[PDB]
């Protein structure tokens, strides 16, 4: 006998360039928590249902988890774009959702059953602009690019644009693209002709990486900031040596000294031979929220005896009140399901000259 928790993430499509890192974190969490006895002796069972890359696939995954798989709660989905369409399904069904990495403005406001462990674009994105200005105080002109078909990218670009203005910089252009585009010659050239000192990109991984590469190919030599959708080593294959120097804000640090992070990091490094990515840590933290909430609930009200609809409602109520020492640091929730989290960072892509290998170097 086990307690089923649904994991609805992008395991296929180009969205899996982000989703697979989340899956990795969730699987590490399952072993970590089950090795500690699960929920007061009862193992959890993560049930994975692939969302693919669109809204319909996410809705289908959620409905399957809720109805067929009888899950007590869902971790997911990968994208804010997917969350805005699918989360209302879970809200209506009174099934809790904990988003690992969705950072668009407005997600917890979807309803009483929607929470997230990822701080939103408003507190994550500005740090990377500040980091760029530290590395080059003479930046004056900024070109901004965003994926106009993606909800998170639109939310993130608004924050980047406001930060550029607040830092007293000149916004020379805002260029639009689609996440499904591979060619950006026209937008890149448009921006390059305006002589920017800094370029900021809000898109996802394949698109963001292709744009970074093309900017460099077309002769751009200035600074580049990538938003959260580019925050994966999966971009390395796309821009290769030309990824070098890209600045990306982080909501997780491998070097954070929390005991659980040490355990998580050690488990990750031993398996994957590199530091745990943000998306992996965030997924771990979302599973942790469910495990620790289930334990607290079970102690007060034995879960094996609670019928499913009431169990879901009580679990949702419980998780919102909890305090969690996670790989992301000590976190909790506001009454609306927004995360409370203290520390943020910026890292910079450092590629080896040959372009076949790289890493994220954390700025001090
Ligand atoms: Mg909420």
From TrEMBL:
GO terms for molecular function: metal ion binding. Pfam families: Peripla_BP_6. Residues 2-353 form the Leucine-binding protein domain. Mg(2+) binds at residues 108, 111, 114, 336. Keywords: Metal-binding, Signal. CDD domains: PBP1_ABC_HAAT-like. It comes from the Bacteria. Pyruvate binds at residues 80, 103, 228. PANTHER family: LEUCINE-SPECIFIC-BINDING PROTEIN (PTHR30483), PERIPLASMIC BINDING PROTEIN OF ABC TRANSPORTER FOR NATURAL AMINO ACIDS (PTHR30483:SF6). Belongs to the leucine-binding protein family. This is Amino acid/amide ABC transporter substrate-binding protein, HAAT family. It comes from Trichormus variabilis (strain ATCC 29413 / PCC 7937) (Anabaena variabilis). The lineage of its organism: Bacteria, Bacillati, Cyanobacteriota, Cyanophyceae, Nostocales.
